[model samples]
Target: SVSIYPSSAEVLKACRNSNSSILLDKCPPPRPPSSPYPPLPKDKLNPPTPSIYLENKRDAFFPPLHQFCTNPNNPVTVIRGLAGALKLDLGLFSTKTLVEANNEHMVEVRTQLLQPADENWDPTGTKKIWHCESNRSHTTIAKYAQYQASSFQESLRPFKTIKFGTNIDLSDDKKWKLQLHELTKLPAFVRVVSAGNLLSHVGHTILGMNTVQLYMKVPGSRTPGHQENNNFCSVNINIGPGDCEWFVVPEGYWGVLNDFCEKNNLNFLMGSWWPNLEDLYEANVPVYRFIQRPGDLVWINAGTVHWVQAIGWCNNIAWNVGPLTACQYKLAVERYEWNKLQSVKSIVPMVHLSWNMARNIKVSDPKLFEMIKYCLLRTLKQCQTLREALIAAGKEIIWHGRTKEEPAHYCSICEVEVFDLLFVTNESNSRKTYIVHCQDCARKTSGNLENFVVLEQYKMEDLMQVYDQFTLAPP
Candidate 1:
């Protein structure tokens, strides 16, 4: 007997009705509900002055995980001379020492083109930069810095005076996570901040959290305005012999910047476009500007937007931490859905993460527990609806029986995360790799259900058991 397959429209409707708490739309994915947490006071929303700087080491010790996680109000902060205060070895970050330690590492350098001498330079305008990958040694990077510092009249050249080695995964390539914490005392500090660092508890390698990264740059190198992935709070320390300049826009005014970028056809999600500071000032937007000196630690709060430029040769090591708080989970989930509407892939998958959190974590905070529970319910319901529709079409299911190294899967066509149920196709040739698609995309890709294979990560009974067993921690 031939069984009819469910159409894309039916599946979409089923998924949309899975959860009433989440607002669904064809274009924008309806605006999220007002935050469950109390709103920041009007005056506290945008402070008139720059972020406070801790001159005393003891004061730095007290903030606990850099104040950004412990206290959201202090979004942008500076801990002056944090490296020296921790008694870290200054020689370890030196140019010679860095070359000796990681000379064989690979890097991608951003080489920017310099504007003509007669042209008026604008920070908000699109930049002409080229990226090239090389397994160059740290000694070569230091030489490039030397060339930039000694050069006179840099505008005469085609390229910027300095190059930026921006994406260095020291944590993954060199196994430097332990040394990073040992040198900076990060683990101890985060411990004092809270015992609920979500990433540390989960220990998922692919999530890109709870890991260290390094950046090497010289004068004229800069990073465009952007937010940290998944709205996690960021910690950046300048392990350097020189200084870097920074500009931070408060969390309240991020919408204004986003609108400005949309109107100007600039990139808002990724870090390609820079903003005009003068335009912001004209619009009565307050921008906090400061200098990050050697040994200084910068705390960037969750969901805050900021940009930076290196004033001199320096090395910066940075990482992110997700504190188990309602505000953090709210922003992360909001972005997770927003990215789906925008067709941008979310770096951290919220549905997958929520289930993992449900199985392993016992959160006592009422608001935090409620937020996670809401996400879990929506995900399980969506999965159940999809599975029922597919089974009605007489499709066979394959259980995932491989290694658990990667728990999250993304659709090849739309880049949207697919939880529990997966649609895969590899019918063309035996040599070609398999391609995965979401329910809607699978139909759009091919008309016959015979071309696609269905797979399930968990049995229906098992998932229902997980949902039923999850409950709030004891008071």
Candidate 2:
């Protein structure tokens, strides 16, 4: 059955008559344009600065788990003495057991070969962090799923791999799942399980943040300096025979470092360049340097920029929790708009998740409620505008009733999730698969509307109901 999509005029009829607060705004303030990507500087060493490490002096670096948990002001704090609190059987993760599993249940691994060492070897510029080009003296290309476990382990440099946002039961015991649940219940993670965590309420597997991820690393492996998507606070615990070293810039200085990267022509969003530490010290950006030993848990604040290197063999369990706080929400929304302007795909679908959160979580914070309301209103307005244009252009519309388990459709070109309605076209590939696109991207791809088909996920009434249900009503 062709579930004909409704016209925007039809939705506008319902919107005008509704008593929802969203209609009162009529339109949200347009998101401001992000700064233009600066061209590369003419001189390679334009901002030459000597390197040095800045230290956090006070012993207040590592706070106790009891002190840290339940604190809404997330910080880069380490809980040092939690050796066995998680109840994870590390013996199960031994190399022998892992190798055995590799033989039976083979898993893909990232592989890289270390280059010969030289005493005077120093990597300069952003390439030192990104390793984006060929001719790197330190290491070979890091190719994903390029080797088997046994071979990947033979390398001299530490190899790293992750089972990102995966919940597959690996063994008969299911100990991994048990341990993951134990971490979430801790007081430190109260907000993670509370109504404030948007990902907590998200049921789809595609959202990824709601579940635990396992990271295995050996010495010399590092994740370059970067911030988590939209400033989701990072919670990580080390399970190991080895300790990991971490360098974190406080949340306030994220902008300083970002500007530094932009001026230097370094990619800001990706974990590409490690800002020269000495430069940060020169600029008064205090970096907290610390070690995360076995069984140690680390809580990194939202929007904090950080880098990590494994000093020894260790497995880490990590996840991101997005609390409905003004700080986090503002950063998330700002990055969301910035990603759109940059044409970079946001890992977290902020708009889609915001609407979902409004329906599922009753936010108490007035600021947070206002942000969510604005995001929902802004999104609905966009959907209506796009739908009206598509209908007027005589675009073909098909009803695709999205199930609870189905995730939002993302544009193939821009990677922006198109809520309510989708624009898709058949690829010229022999497989003849269809690629979904957002309205703007669809028009960019082809000026002819006949070349694309539109899929509507929800009726405008259904969306209006979702919007009306989320509000701070009078007692």
Candidate 3:
């Protein structure tokens, strides 16, 4: 039996502290007029089109995973980091080496193990070694596998097969040619197993780490049994890891534990609400979600089970995964059980898509393909505008709030302090107000450089003046 930590109080406190208030008010009010593309009709907008368009196939609407999986006619668009304006066009057939994939040249795989330790051990101290046993059970793996295999097969079977190679170089210099037919080579069975293996391996390698961060978006619809319909995009970064591992047990055990936490008003550590690969086999709920927004980041830890809303976009980056246990065997054993169970339950035997096989079909439809392109462009533009606004606001805030210089005059309408620098006029008169500048208020008044007086040495003086203004303020 797994030991439950007595320190649920401390874990509950951290959960409360880390839980952030959703900033519904802070999100800019929707502006219908500002959108370049006409809003989809009310019916279309309310139930956003499923990213996956195959008939009778399960729909996965979340953006990140959708973009990776959906059969969009156009190549996937890759924007630089949220703040960066760089755009790299990723074709359907593009490949990137593992080194290029990381971009930092850091490719070393690291591991950690989670184990019992003294309660008094420093929470802040970094301990490289941990004494943890294999808490994973064969039954659990089998259950998870069965769920995953059935779920993926149902959603993916209708689409043309696709092969997406990771850790391969597809840079311009690589001269690698990717074909449309070549994309449909990945088998559903292999994909499920591959994903399970990745999760199990990562889990085992970093078991001892105090925290793990996962970034994902959940479906918009609420889980069938969950009461709360809190539909908000989220980025969960779990700080304290060991506190939530107790939830990974049989359903019967989990029910009791859930009740205990509810009775005591404790925060139970459970995985995100997204159905794991196992959930697919049992419930057959769709698992994939899309990332609509570029540069959107989602962070998760081991114990945080999150769900996504139907139509949102996100990109994820995870950090600090060195202390978890890697359990490849557990995952493999689970797959074996799933395969066996599927053989018994499936009425129609399923065929796995081999990497070498290709499904030939018309690559494009003029109307839908055009629509997809337009949507992509529209999304990219919205992101660009938002990014510009943030940068401008940041610059103004830094100049006004942090700068120490006194303003020569305060403008009530502008709500800003203005300064005038001494400059000689072309008439050779003594210094006059040749240039009036207010970094805070200047955004509103717009004219070409010709509107400003050609003050002698205004460039150097203005720089020095702004510098002096800020230097006088406390950092």
Candidate 4:
């Protein structure tokens, strides 16, 4: 008998047909017994507070998940149908899953362009800077402080600066609106929904994936404490294809997962497998350190902590939550600390003078300098608090974690063990192989033990064997 596979066209159609309406009202009410976490303490430093709108509107939290499970109502339905027809288990139906699924089949290419240090390099060209009285209060002091730092060349970089729009107008009189048009023109930009092959406009389903962006810093960048005064600014915003939204980093800007782990003295383990970048990808537990290069795509399950290095100018497109997350700040902190430690190694106690100045400076002179130090320490503390809150919340919130289901809910035929590895050789001319144990007979099998059965085996020497192939190319 011939097996049937759902065509990609079918899945696309189903996805388009999937209702766009928010459907949280149809989901089961929050189970009181399922609330395992302690009631959020009133004085808990920066407690997780749902948005005011989210509190008043009880249905927002559930819609994203509901939307994930239902098939789209358009041509993209074919994509989902094809997966079902093939009996292939795509992961969850969430936006995250779709991106991951499509990414598996899409190619990402990275090209570096050296931009000149000129006005045209401005990312915020001709966009109005939205200024409110509240923002102005901080903006004035910050710009003045930046000017002072630039003027005196302070020993430790006093401030970091980021331009709000493409133009360098930092005045209070300007009318401003950050636009997404500038970002979409960049070569590296990719939209999450489109990348997941989940674009639904009216009744038509467009099936193409977007590219991925990998941000890294070049070696020998300015060390944080090395300069007397360093002016640095970090700007974060979420840009939907047609809309631009400014994102605010949470109070504690601890760097990325590595920084969180370092401060807490926890081990940082990078996950080996990500969600398949194909249709109907499922959600998975939070893991770290999956790197993507050009031509490689990633399906990042929700809540995964991935960090981008601060190298040259970088941009990315994401869905669901804001463009960036807490992880970005965490990564920044990690880099800062790592560089601070490096400075200490080269010149013992290089940061000692700044520390002393920060600690002992009189209250009257250079009040701005003192304020900046205080702000830095305050930010650091907040980051630490945020890290703790996340860890504690993870333990208490069951819904925050991924579910482990038998017969692997995402793939019917593939049984995935978190750390299992399978090996294949060109000599066998086989596709891919999975190493698995026989649950029925409790026997270990390898290599074509059963028809249509992908083997699941673990090898202790796979890493070493692969490393052996690494050799210098002929000069």
Instruction: Quote each prediction's TM-score.
Output: 0.79, 0.72, 0.17, 0.17
Clashing pairs in 2: none
What Cα-based lDDT does every candidate model obtain? 0.64, 0.58, 0.23, 0.23
For residues 258-350, could you state the per-residue lDDT of candidate 3 as single tens digits?
Answer: 343344343233211222333222322222223334322232222222333212211122222111111212222222223333321211111
Cα deviation at 306, candidate 1, in Å, is 0.4
- Over the full model, what C-alpha lDDT does candidate 2 score relative to the true structure? 0.58
Between 1 and 4, whose lDDT is larger? 1
Q: What does candidate 1's lDDT look like per residue over 392-473, in tens digits? A: 7778688853354565778989999987887888562133454668888988866756578877877767666666566777
- The 10-residue segment with the lowest total lDDT in model 3: 349-358
Model 3 bad stretches (over 4 Å)? 1-260, 264-267, 270-294, 299-316, 320-475
The residue-by-residue lDDT of candidate 4 on 1-475, one tens digit each, is 2212222233233333445531122323221122114332334322221221222122223444223212111100001112222222222222233233332221122211212221111223342111110111122323332432343343234113322211112111122111222223221112222221211111121111111221111211111100100101111222111111111112112133233334434332321111111110111111122222221122222222222222222122222211121232222233334433333111111122222223333223233333334333332333333334434545221121212221211111122111121222223214433332322222133232233222222121331222222221232
Winner of 1 and 3 under lDDT: 1
User: Who wins the lDDT comparison?
Assistant: 1
Q: Which predicted model would earn the best TM-score?
A: 1
